[PDB]
Tab-separated table of C-alpha atoms in Angstrom:
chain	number	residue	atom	x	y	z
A	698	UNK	CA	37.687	-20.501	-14.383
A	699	UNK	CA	34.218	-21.778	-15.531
A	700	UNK	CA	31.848	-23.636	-12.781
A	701	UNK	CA	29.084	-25.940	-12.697
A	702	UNK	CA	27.742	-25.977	-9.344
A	703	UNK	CA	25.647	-29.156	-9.635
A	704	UNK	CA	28.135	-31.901	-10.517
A	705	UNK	CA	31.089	-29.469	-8.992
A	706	UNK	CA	32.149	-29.731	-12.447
A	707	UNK	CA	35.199	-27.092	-12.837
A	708	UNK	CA	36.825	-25.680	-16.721
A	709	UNK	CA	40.466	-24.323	-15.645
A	710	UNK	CA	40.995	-23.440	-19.270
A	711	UNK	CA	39.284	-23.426	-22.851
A	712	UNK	CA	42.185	-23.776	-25.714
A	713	UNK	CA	41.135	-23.325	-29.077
A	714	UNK	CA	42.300	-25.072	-31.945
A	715	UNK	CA	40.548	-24.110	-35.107
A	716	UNK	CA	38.057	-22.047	-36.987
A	717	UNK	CA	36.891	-22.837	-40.101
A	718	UNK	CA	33.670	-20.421	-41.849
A	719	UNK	CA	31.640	-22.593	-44.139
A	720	UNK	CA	32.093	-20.254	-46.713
A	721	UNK	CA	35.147	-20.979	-48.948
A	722	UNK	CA	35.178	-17.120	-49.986
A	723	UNK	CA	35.360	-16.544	-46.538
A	724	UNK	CA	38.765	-18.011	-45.997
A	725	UNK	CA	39.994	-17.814	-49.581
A	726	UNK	CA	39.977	-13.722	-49.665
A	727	UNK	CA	40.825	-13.605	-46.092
A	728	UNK	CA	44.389	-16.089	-47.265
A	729	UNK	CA	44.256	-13.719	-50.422
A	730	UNK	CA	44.453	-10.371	-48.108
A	731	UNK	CA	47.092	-11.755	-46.140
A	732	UNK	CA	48.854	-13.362	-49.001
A	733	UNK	CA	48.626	-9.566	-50.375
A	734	UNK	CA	49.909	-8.414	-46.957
A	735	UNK	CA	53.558	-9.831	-47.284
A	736	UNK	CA	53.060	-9.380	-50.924
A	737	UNK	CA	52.838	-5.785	-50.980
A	738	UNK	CA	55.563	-5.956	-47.910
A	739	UNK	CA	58.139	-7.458	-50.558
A	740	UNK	CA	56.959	-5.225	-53.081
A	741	UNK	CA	57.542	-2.302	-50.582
A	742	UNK	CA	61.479	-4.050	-50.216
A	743	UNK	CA	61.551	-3.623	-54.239
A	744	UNK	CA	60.476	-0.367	-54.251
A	745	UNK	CA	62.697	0.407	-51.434
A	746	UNK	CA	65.579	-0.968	-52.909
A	747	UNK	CA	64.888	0.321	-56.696
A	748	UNK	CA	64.909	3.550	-55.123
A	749	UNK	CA	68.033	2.636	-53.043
A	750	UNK	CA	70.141	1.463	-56.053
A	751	UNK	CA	68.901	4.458	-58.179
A	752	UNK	CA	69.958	6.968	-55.048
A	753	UNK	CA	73.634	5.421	-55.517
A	754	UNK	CA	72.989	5.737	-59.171
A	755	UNK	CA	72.562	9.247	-58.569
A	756	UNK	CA	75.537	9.856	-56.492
A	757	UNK	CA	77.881	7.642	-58.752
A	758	UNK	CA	76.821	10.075	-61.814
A	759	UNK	CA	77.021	13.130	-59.717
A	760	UNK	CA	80.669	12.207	-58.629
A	761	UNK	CA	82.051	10.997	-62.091
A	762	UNK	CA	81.022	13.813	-63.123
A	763	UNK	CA	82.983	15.678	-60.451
A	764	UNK	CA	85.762	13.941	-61.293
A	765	UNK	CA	85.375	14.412	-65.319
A	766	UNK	CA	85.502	18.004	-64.036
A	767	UNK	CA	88.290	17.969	-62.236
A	768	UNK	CA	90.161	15.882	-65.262
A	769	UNK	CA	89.071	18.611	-67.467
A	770	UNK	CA	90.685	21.302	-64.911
A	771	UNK	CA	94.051	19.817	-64.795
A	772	UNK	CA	93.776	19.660	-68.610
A	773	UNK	CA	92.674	22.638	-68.877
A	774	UNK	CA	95.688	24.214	-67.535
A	775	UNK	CA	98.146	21.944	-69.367
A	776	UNK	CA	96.553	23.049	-72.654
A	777	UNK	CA	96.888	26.804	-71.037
A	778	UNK	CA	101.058	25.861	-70.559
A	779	UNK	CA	100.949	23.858	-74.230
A	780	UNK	CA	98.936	27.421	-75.556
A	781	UNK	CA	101.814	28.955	-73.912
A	782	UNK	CA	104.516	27.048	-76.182
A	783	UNK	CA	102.375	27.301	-79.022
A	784	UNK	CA	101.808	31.018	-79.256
A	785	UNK	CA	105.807	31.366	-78.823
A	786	UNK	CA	106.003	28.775	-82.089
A	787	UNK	CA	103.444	30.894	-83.627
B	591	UNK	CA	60.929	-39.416	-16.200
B	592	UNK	CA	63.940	-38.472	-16.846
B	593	UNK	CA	65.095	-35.255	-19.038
B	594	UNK	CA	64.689	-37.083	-22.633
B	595	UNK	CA	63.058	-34.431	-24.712
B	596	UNK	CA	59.584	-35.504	-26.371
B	597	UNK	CA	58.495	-33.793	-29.602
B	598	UNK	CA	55.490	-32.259	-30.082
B	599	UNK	CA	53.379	-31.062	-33.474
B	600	UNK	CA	50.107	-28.624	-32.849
B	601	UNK	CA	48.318	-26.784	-35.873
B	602	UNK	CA	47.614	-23.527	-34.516
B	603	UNK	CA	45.994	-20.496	-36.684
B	604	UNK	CA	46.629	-16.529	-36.902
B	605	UNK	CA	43.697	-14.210	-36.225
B	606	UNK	CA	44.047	-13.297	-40.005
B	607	UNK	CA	43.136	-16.665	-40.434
B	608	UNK	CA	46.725	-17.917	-41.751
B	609	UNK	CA	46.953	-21.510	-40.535
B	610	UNK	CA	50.678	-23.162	-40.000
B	611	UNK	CA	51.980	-26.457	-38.735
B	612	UNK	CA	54.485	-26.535	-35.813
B	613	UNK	CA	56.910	-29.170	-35.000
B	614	UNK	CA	57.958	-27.895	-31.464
B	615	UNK	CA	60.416	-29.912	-29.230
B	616	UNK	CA	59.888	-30.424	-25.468
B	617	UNK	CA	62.147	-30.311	-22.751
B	618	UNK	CA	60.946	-32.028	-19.645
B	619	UNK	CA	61.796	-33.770	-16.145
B	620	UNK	CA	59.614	-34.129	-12.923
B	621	UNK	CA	61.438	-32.243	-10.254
B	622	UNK	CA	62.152	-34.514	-6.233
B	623	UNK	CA	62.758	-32.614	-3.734
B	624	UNK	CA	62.848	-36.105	-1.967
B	625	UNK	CA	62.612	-39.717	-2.739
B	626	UNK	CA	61.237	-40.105	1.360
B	627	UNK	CA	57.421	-38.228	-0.017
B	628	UNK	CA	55.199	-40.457	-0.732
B	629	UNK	CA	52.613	-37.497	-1.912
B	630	UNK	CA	55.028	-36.213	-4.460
B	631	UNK	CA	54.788	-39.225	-5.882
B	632	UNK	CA	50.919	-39.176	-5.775
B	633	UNK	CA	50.803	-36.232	-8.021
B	634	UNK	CA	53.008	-37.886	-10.612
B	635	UNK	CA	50.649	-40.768	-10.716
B	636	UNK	CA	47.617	-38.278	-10.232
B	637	UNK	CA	47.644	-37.792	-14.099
B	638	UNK	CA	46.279	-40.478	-16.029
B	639	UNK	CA	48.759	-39.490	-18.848
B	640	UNK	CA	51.446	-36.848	-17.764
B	641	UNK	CA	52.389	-36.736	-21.824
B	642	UNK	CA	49.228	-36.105	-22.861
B	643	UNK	CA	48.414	-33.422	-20.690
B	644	UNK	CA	51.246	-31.731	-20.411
B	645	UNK	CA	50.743	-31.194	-24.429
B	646	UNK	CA	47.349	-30.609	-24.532
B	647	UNK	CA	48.195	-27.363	-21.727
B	648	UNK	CA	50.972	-26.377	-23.685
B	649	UNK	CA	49.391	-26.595	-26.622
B	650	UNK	CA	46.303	-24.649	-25.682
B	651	UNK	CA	49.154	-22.222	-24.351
B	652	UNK	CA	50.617	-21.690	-27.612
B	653	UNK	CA	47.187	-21.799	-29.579
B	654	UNK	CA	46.144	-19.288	-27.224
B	655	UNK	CA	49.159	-17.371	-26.764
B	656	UNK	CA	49.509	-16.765	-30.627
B	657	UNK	CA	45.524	-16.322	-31.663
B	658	UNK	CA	45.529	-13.105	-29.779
B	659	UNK	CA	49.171	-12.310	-31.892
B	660	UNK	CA	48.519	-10.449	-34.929
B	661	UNK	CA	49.552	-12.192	-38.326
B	662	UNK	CA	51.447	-8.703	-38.480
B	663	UNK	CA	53.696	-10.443	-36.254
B	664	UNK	CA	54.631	-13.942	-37.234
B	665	UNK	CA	58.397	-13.661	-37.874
B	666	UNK	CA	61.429	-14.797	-36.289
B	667	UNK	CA	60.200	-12.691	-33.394
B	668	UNK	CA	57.359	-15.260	-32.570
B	669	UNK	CA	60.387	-17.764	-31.436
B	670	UNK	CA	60.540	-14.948	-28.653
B	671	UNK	CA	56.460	-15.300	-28.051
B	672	UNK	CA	56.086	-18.571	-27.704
B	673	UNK	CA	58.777	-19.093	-25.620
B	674	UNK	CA	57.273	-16.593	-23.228
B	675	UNK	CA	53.947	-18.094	-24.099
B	676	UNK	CA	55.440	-21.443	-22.279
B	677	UNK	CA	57.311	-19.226	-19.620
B	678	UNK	CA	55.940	-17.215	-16.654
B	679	UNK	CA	56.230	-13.659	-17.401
B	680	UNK	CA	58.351	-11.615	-14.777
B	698	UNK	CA	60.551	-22.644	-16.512
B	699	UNK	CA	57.043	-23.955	-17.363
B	700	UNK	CA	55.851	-25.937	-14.164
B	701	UNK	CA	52.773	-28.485	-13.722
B	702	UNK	CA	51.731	-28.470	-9.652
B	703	UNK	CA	49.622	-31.224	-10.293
B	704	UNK	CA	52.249	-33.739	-11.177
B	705	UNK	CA	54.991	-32.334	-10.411
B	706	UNK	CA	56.228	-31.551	-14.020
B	707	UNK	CA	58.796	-29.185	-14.910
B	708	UNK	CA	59.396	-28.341	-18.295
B	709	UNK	CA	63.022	-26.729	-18.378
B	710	UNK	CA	62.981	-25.315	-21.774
B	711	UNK	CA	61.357	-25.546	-25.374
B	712	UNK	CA	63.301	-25.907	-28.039
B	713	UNK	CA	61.635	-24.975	-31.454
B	714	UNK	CA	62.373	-26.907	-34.739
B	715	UNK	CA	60.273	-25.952	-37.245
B	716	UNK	CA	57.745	-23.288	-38.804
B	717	UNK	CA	55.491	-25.220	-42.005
B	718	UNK	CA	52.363	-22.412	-42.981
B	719	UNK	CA	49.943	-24.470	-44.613
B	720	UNK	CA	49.802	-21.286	-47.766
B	721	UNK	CA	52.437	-22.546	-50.303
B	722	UNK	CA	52.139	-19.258	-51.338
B	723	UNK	CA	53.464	-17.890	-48.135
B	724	UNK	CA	56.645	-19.397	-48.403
B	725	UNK	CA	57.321	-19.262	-51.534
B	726	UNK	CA	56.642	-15.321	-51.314
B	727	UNK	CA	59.354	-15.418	-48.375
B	728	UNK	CA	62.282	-17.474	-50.065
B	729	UNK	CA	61.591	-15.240	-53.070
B	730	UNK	CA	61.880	-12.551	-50.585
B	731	UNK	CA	65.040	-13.334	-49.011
B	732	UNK	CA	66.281	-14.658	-52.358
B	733	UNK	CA	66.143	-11.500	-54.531
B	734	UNK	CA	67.652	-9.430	-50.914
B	735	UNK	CA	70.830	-11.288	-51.292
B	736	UNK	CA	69.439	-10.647	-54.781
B	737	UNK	CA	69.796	-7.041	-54.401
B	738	UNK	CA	72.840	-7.263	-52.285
C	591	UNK	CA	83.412	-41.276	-22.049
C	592	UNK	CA	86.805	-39.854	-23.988
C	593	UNK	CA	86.887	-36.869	-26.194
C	594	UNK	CA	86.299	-38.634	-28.931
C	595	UNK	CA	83.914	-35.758	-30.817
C	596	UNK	CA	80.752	-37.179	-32.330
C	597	UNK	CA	79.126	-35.467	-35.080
C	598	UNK	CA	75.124	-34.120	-35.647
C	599	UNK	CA	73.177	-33.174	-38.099
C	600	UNK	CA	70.580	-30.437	-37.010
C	601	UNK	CA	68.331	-28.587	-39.163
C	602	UNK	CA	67.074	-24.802	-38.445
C	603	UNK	CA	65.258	-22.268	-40.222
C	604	UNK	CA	65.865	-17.901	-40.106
C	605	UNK	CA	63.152	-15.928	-39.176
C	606	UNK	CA	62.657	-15.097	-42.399
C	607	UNK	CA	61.961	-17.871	-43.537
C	608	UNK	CA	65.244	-19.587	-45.200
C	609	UNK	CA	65.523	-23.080	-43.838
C	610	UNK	CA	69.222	-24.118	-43.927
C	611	UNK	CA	70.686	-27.570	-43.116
C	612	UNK	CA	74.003	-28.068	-40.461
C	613	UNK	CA	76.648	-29.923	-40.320
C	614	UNK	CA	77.990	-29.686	-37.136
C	615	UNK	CA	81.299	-31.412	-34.450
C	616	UNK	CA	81.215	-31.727	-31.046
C	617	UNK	CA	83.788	-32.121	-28.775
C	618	UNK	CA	82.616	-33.824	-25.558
C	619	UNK	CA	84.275	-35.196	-22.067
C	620	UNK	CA	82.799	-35.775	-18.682
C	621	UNK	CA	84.995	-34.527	-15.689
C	622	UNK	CA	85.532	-36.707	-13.227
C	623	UNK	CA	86.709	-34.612	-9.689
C	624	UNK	CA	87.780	-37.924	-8.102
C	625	UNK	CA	87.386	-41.595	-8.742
C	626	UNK	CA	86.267	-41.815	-4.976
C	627	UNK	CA	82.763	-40.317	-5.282
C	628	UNK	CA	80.396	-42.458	-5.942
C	629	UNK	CA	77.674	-39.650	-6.640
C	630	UNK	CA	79.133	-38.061	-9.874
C	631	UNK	CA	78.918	-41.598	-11.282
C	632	UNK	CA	75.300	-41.511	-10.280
C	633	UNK	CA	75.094	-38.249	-12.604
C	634	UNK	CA	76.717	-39.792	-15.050
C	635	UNK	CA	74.180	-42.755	-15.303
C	636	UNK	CA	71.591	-40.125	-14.611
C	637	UNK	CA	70.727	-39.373	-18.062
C	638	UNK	CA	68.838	-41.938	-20.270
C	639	UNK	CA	71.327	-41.387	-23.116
C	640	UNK	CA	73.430	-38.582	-22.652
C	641	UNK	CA	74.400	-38.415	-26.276
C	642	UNK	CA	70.665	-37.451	-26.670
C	643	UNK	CA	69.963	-35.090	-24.520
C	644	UNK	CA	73.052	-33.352	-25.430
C	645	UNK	CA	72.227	-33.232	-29.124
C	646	UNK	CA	68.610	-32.144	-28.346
C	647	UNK	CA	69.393	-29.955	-25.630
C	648	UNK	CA	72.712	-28.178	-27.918
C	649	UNK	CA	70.594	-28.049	-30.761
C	650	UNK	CA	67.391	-26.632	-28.697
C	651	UNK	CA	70.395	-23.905	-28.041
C	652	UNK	CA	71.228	-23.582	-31.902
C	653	UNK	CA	68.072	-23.063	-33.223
C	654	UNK	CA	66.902	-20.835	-30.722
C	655	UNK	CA	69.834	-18.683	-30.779
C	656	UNK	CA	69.426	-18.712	-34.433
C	657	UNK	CA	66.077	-18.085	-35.003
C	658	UNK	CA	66.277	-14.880	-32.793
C	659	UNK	CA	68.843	-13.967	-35.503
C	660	UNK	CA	67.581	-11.937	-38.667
C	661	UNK	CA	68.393	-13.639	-41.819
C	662	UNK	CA	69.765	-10.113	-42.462
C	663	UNK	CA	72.791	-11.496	-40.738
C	664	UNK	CA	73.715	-15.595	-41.862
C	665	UNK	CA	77.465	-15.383	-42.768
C	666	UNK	CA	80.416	-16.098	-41.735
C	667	UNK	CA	79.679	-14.205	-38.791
C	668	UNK	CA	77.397	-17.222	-38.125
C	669	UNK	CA	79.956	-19.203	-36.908
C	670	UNK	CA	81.367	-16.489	-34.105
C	671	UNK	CA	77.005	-16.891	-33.401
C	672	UNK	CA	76.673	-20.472	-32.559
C	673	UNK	CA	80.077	-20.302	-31.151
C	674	UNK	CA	78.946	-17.640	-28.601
C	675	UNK	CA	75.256	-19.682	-28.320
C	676	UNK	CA	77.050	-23.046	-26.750
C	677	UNK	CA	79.337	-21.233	-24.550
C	678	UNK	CA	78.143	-18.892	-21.929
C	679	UNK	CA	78.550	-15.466	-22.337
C	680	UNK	CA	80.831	-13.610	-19.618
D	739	UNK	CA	40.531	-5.994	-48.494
D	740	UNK	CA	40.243	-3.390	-51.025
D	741	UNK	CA	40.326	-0.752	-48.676
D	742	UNK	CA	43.706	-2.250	-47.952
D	743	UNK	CA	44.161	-2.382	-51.647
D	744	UNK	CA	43.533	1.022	-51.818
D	745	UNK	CA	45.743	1.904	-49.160
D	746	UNK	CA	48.979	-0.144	-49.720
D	747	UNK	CA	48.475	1.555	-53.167
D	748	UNK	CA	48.114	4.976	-52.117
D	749	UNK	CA	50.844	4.379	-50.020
D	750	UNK	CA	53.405	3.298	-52.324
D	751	UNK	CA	52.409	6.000	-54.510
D	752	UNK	CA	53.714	8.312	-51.470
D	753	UNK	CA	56.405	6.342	-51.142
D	754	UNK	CA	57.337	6.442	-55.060
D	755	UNK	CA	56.592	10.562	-54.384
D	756	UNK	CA	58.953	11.192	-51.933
D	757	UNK	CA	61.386	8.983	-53.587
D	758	UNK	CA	60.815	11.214	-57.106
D	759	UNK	CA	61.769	14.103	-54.681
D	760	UNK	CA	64.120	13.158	-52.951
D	761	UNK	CA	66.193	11.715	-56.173
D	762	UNK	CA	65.258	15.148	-57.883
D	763	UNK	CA	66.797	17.100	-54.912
D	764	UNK	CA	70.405	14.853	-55.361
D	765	UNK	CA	69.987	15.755	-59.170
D	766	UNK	CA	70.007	19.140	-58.011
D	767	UNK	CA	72.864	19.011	-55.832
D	768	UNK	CA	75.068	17.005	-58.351
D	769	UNK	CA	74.142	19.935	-60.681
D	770	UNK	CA	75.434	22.399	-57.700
D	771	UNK	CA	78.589	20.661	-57.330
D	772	UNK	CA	79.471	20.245	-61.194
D	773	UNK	CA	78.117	23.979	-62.002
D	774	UNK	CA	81.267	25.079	-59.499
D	775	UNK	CA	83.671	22.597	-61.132
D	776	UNK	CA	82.701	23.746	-64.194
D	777	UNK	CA	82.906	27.508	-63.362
D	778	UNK	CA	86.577	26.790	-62.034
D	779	UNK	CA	86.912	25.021	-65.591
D	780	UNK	CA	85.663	28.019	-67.233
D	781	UNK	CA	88.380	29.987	-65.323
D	782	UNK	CA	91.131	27.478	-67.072
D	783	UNK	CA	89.167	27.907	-70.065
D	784	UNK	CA	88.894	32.100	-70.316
D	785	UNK	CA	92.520	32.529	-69.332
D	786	UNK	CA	93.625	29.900	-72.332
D	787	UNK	CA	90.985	31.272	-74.662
């Protein structure tokens, strides 16, 4: 703690409570860069989540297609049993 | 003296130079540890005003406390900092008069940058948005 | 002094930012040991206004346990939160 | 500030990159997965041709 001998004068503590530049650029880029800080934080979350929804985009596709696959499979060999009928009609 | 909780609002201002209100609740009661003392009592009548000091500590505490905090960090986590801003590191207690403050209860957060939280209820907004 | 729950009305914000207003019950008795002692009746006139301390003190527990929560999580999981916040944890 | 510019920039950019490359990679292993369904198909297909 701070001490001034000749009035035994003693500063426990020294709390601060503001500082404020005279110039206005000063604090108006320095709000600006922070302002930009969470700014480019949320736009970080979009990007994240654009990418996110167009990853389960990607696996939705992927897996309908599977399944159009797997559709055309089964078909396939019911067309190969109908071929079957058909050839004997033929 | 009793534990009747007086409110408290200090400005305080982030080393990125973000300033933000506070409206910050305080716990407090002056401890006895008997009525037969008469020098207890003389430090809870050493203070001229017991209120006044006890928030100007805190407050330098908290002003303190969060300066050397990065604006990095200035989310819900900060509840935690403050709270062991107020709290020895391991109640708040004033030897002087005898104070004891218990526990602080926070209330509200109000940065003076409209932009601020606007950007963060936008935020939140388009996550249950994007949910 | 009868359980007669009185209501309150406590506002709190999320850590990220989302204030959110509460309305919010409590249920609310004092025990009484024995009619005989003459010392619990001296806690009971202890408090000021008990009705205040409890709602500053309960709500002091609310937002704190709250604002420790993300904003990731404010459902209806909320109310097992709060729930868990006045009651001790065993 | 607009080193920080610069940076959150650049950094999104690598962000968008391995994003573009990782999404590329899934296209790849969609393409995997349906290039077997479809050879099984072409087995259907051959023995009804």
């Amino acid at each position: 703690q701070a001490v001034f001998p000749q009035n035994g004068l003693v500063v426990s503590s020294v709390d601060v409570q503001s500082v404020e530049p005279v110039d206005q650029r000063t604090r108006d880029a320095l709000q600006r860069s922070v302002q930009l800080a969470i700014e480019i934080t949320t736009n970080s979350q979009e990007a994240a989540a654009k990418h996110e929804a167009q990853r389960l985009e990607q696996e939705a596709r992927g897996r309908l297609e599977r399944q159009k696959i797997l559709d055309q499979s089964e078909a396939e060999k019911a067309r190969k049993e109908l071929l079957e009928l058909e050839a004997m009609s033929m | 003296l009793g534990p009747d909780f007086f409110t408290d609002v200090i400005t305080i201002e982030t080393a990125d130079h973000a300033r933000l209100q506070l409206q910050l609740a305080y716990n407090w009661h002056f401890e006895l540890k008997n009525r037969n003392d008469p020098a207890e009592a003389a430090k809870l009548f050493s203070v001229p005003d017991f209120v006044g000091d006890a928030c100007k500590a805190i407050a330098s505490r908290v002003r303190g406390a969060v300066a050397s905090v990065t604006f990095d960090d200035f989310h819900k986590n900060s509840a935690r900092i403050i709270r062991m801003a107020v709290f020895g590191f391991e109640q708040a207690v004033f030897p002087q008069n005898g104070l004891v403050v218990s526990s602080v209860d926070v209330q509200s957060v109000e940065p003076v940058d409209q932009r601020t939280r606007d950007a963060l209820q936008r935020s939140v907004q388009l996550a249950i948005e994007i949910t």
